[PDB]
Amino acid sequence: KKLSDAQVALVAAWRKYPDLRESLEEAASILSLIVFQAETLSDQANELANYIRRQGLEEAEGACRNIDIMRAKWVEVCGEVNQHGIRVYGDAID
Amino acid sequence: EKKLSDAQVALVAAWRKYPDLRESLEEAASILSLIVFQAETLSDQANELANYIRRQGLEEAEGACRNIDIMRAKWVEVCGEVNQHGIRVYGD
């Protein structure tokens, strides 16, 4: 149920069967790209929600709470990249 | 060129060819699916927030809104778009 489980399964695959490497490293590359684009948009959405709240635009606060909730759910599945460029999960996040 | 559907069938072809892989790689496929769905849920929410901003005519955040549009369009290049009949379809 974590992004890391998926990463490890791909690698385990072409470790065990090397003929799958080119293909599965391709799949890993796409999963990596998808996670990156998602986190890019999520950060932008978070910045938009900060704008809303800082401006006192309470009419949109529900959608902002939704965004908060969606980000927290995402981090559970995918963790968070720390200051050193390392993706970490749970209490390792702080 | 880099497409979600490409990733998804790479997994299926793998366990097709080596059934001992099905448990782990189908789990992997399920996680990739869940990631796409969660991202698309947030994206749609972000879109409606930009929609609200633009209906208020708030120019201060128009830049962020146009960034959202740019990101949603790049996403559809990779992951396609679900049409009204539930079929994920990729730009032609």
Residue numbers in the entry:
A (entry chain A): 3 to 96
B (entry chain B): 2 to 93
Pull text from the paper.
We previously reported that gene 34 from Pseudomonas phage JBD5, which encodes the protein AcrE1, shows anti-CRISPR activity against the type I-E system of P. aeruginosa strain SMC4386 (4). We show that AcrE1 binds to the CRISPR-associated helicase/nuclease Cas3 and that the C-terminal region of the anti-CRISPR protein is important for its inhibitory activity.
(c) Structural overlay of the X-ray crystal structures of the AcrE1 proteins with an N-terminal (blue) and C-terminal (red) 6×His tag reveals virtually identical structures. Thus, the unusual nature of the C-terminal sheet was not a result of the presence of the 6×His affinity purification tag fused to the C terminus. The C-terminal β-sheet region is unusual because both sides of the sheet are exposed to solvent, contrasting with typical β-sheets, which pack a hydrophobic surface on one side against helices or other sheets. We also examined the packing of the C-terminal β-sheet within the crystal and observed no contacts that stabilize it in this position. This sheet structure appears to be stabilized by multiple interactions between residues at the base of the sheet and residues in helices 1, 2, and 3. A salt bridge is formed between E41 and R89.
